[PDB]
Amino acid sequence: PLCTLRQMLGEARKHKYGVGAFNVNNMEQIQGIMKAVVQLKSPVILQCSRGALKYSDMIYLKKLCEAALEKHPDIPICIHLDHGDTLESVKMAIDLGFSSVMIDASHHPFDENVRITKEVVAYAHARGVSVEAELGTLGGIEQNTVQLTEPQDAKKFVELTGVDALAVAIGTSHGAYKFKSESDIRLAIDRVKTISDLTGIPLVMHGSSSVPKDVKDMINKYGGKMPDAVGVPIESIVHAIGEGVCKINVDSDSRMAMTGAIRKVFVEHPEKFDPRDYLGPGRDAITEMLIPKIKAFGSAGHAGDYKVVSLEEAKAWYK
Amino acid sequence: PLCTLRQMLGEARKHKYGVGAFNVNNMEQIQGIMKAVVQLKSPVILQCSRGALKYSDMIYLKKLCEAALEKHPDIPICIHLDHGDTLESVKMAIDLGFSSVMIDASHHPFDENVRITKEVVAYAHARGVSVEAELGTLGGIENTVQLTEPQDAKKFVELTGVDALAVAIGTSHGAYKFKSESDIRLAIDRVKTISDLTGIPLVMHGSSSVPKDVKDMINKYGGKMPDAVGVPIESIVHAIGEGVCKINVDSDSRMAMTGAIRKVFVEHPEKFDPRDYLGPGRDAITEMLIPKIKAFGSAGHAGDYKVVSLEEAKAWYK
Numbered sequence: 133p134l135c136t137l138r139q140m141l142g143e144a145r146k147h148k149y150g151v152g153a154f155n156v157n158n159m160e161q162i163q164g165i166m167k168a169v170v171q172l173k174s175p176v177i178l179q180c181s182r183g184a185l186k187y188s189d190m191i192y193l194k195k196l197c198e199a200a201l202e203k204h205p206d207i208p209i210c211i212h213l214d215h216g217d218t219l220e221s222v223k224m225a226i227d228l229g230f231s232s233v234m235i236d237a238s239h240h241p242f243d244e245n246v247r248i249t250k251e252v253v254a255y256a257h258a259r260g261v262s263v264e265a266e267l268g269t270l271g272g273i274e275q276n277t278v279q280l281t282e283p284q285d286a287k288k289f290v291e292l293t294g295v296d297a298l299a300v301a302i303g304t305s306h307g308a309y310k311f312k313s314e315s316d317i318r319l320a321i322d323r324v325k326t327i328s329d330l331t332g333i334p335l336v337m338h339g340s341s342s343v344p345k346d347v348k349d350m351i352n353k354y355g356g357k358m359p360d361a362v363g364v365p366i367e368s369i370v371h372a373i374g375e376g377v378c379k380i381n382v383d384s385d386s387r388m389a390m391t392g393a394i395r396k397v398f399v400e401h402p403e404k405f406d407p408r409d410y411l412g413p414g415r416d417a418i419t420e421m422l423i424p425k426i427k428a429f430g431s432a433g434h435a436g437d438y439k440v441v442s443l444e445e446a447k448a449w450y451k
Numbered sequence: 452p453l454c455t456l457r458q459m460l461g462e463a464r465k466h467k468y469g470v471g472a473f474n475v476n477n478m479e480q481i482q483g484i485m486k487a488v489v490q491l492k493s494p495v496i497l498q499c500s501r502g503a504l505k506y507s508d509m510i511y512l513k514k515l516c517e518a519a520l521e522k523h524p525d526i527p528i529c530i531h532l533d534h535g536d537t538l539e540s541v542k543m544a545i546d547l548g549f550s551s552v553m554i555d556a557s558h559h560p561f562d563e564n565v566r567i568t569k570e571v572v573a574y575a576h577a578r579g580v581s582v583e584a585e586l587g588t589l590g591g592i593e594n595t596v597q598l599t600e601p602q603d604a605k606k607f608v609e610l611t612g613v614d615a616l617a618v619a620i621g622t623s624h625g626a627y628k629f630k631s632e633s634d635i636r637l638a639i640d641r642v643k644t645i646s647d648l649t650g651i652p653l654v655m656h657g658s659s660s661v662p663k664d665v666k667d668m669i670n671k672y673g674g675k676m677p678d679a680v681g682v683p684i685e686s687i688v689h690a691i692g693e694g695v696c697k698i699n700v701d702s703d704s705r706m707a708m709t710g711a712i713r714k715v716f717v718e719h720p721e722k723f724d725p726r727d728y729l730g731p732g733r734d735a736i737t738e739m740l741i742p743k744i745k746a747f748g749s750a751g752h753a754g755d756y757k758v759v760s761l762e763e764a765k766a767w768y769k
């Protein structure tokens with residue numbers, strides 16, 4: 133059923149596992165993700181960016197998420213707004229029925245980040261909706277302007293805002309080119325345990341796609357041009373999860389799985405022109421790439437662990 | 452609003468225009484179709500085959516159709532089960548909220564065709580749901596093709612009570628309808644006779660046109676469809692004038708989307724975000740449909756009538 137981020141991540145924090153949050157843009161992507169989480173009896177966070185809502189004219193994505201929720205009533209499903217930039221984008225997401233929102237004011241100075249975030253927290257918690265915010269900016273470590281999260285400031289930021297989850301900056305970045313090479317992977321995950329203990333809340337890792345070999349090789353084997361793609365190694369994510377990371381954002385891996393599958397069909401069977409002929413394999417490649425990932429995050433088998441608290445009932449938490 | 456096939460095609464028949472019935476399977480297809488009919492202010496039939504319902508686990512296609520209905524409240528939109536094979540598939544479509552169904556028992560002998568169709572008509576009409584049936588089989592003239600016998604069409608409609616009849620005049624499903632674009636033979640000559648004898652809206656299946664720009668793009672970017680050929684648009688326009696009210700189109704949309712994705716794959720092999728290629732695929736569908744819808748004649752008619760709900764429609768059959 134529709135689940136808040138606060139409960140879903142609280143349960144992950146308590147039992148030391150992580151929950152993958154997968155960005156969705158259309159029907160086959162949601163189907164591919166759901167087949168994987170349903171098979172593994174895992175909770176899931178379906179997230180939609182402002183760009184996804186635009187691409188889907190908002191209503192189509194809302195209806196698709198409803199379909200997922202209706203079809204698998206036994207799976208805790210959080211519908212989350214990714215990278216919300218204003219209170220207005222948050223009001224919009226809540227009106228579409230979302231149970232969680234991220235207000236990203238990380239490129240503003242600390243006090244303005246706190247101000248913007250507090251406004252969203254007052255509005256969202258009044259409706260039982262969860263809030264994730266960010267302190268520190270994404271980007272690779274290696275004139276540098278990336279601002280990694282300072283644990284003592286994360287402590288103050290959470291105390292001033294009351295957010296349910298905090299996205300941290302530890303050297304990851306969005307996209308398929310996270311590090312110059314596979315031998316040049318530098319992350320700042322040693323601070324995760326410190327942030328977790330000082331803040332006392334679930335932490336979120338962004339730009340955490342792994343760019344698995346199978347998927348990258350298929351794309352490059354069939355006309356694709358992504359020779360230098362590199363993502364975050366799964367062992368690193370597992371380590372961070374053990375330290376307090378409860379939500380892991382993944383988008384690029386599912387995009388690549390679908391693209392690689394389509395490129396293979398186009399080459400092997402050039403006479404086929406039915407979109408189902410290649411979007412089907414695409415959906416399935418997403419499911420297959422996700423199964424071992426979800427097992428490593430550890431959320432497998434946990435979908436049944438708890439009675440899901442509704443948004444109306446969740447309003448009590450903030451009173 | 453959700454609209455019956457009986458009302459939608461009755462309006463088309465009276466003003467002598469045809470309504471495109473477009474097969475949908477996912478979000479981008481429904482969005483590309485809607486953008487075109489909304490831009491031309493035209494009614495539209497969105498049709499789902501059993502394969503499309505299986506592909507979408509039924510529920511995702513239902514919800515997507517609800518989105519289109521909610522987003523464009525002023526456009527009459529008929530949601531129709533294409534090629535239903537049994538009363539069981541018809542029940543499934545009716546339970547999902549469909550306003551129209553096709554029961555295709557055309558490969559059965561006339562009596563059994565009539566028996567299967569009548570059973571579906573009793574059940575659907577009890578719910579206000581329209582029924583399309585078929586007499587004659589699809590396939591090219593050139594052989595197991597059985598073109599529609601007009602005096603038999605009259606008897607079939609009288610005995611079944613269907614709201615629309617799909618006719619067999621030499622078209623067939625798919626992208627390879629004729630051996631060569633120079634010898635295309637159809638039977639549009641009998642369309643007017645069937646229309647007058649039956650007195651009801653007629654349906655043309657297998658009516659994609661396989662336009663050159665769409666064919667060329669596929670073959671330019673790695674595709675292998677050198678011999679593809681469709682029905683010339685002028686012949687469909689003529690048939691609409693003789694009484695065809697619904698024109699089934701599916702291959703053209705499949706080709707337009709496939710052609711666009713192949714183009715992006717080749718021009719920007721570094722892109723991997725599905726939105727970068729399905730977006731252009733969706734737009735290609737819309738651009739290909741606009742001149743087709745204009746030629747069918749339904750542009751500007753979306754606001755001609757007040758749509759009768761399924762519940763109100765029950766009274767037509769009592």
Ligand SMILES: O=C(COP(=O)(O)O)[C@@H](O)[C@@H](O)[C@H](O)COP(=O)(O)O
Nearest residue numbers: 181183307338339340341381383384
């Ligand atoms: O962290 C993430 C994935 O990182 P990764 O590239 O590692 O999958 C997500 O929260 C966002 O970055 C999301 O992918 C942005 O999507 P759009 O704005 O629609 O292009």
Ligand SMILES: O=C(COP(=O)(O)O)[C@@H](O)[C@@H](O)[C@H](O)COP(=O)(O)O
Nearest residue numbers: 500502625656657658659699701702
């Ligand atoms: O008449 C039609 C299109 O003709 P055309 O091929 O000329 O577009 C449609 O009623 C059907 O043929 C439809 O395409 C079948 O879809 P699936 O069973 O899901 O593969």
Ligand SMILES: [Zn+2]
Nearest residue numbers: 306338339381
């Ligand atoms: Zn992000």
Ligand SMILES: [Zn+2]
Nearest residue numbers: 624656657699
């Ligand atoms: Zn057909």
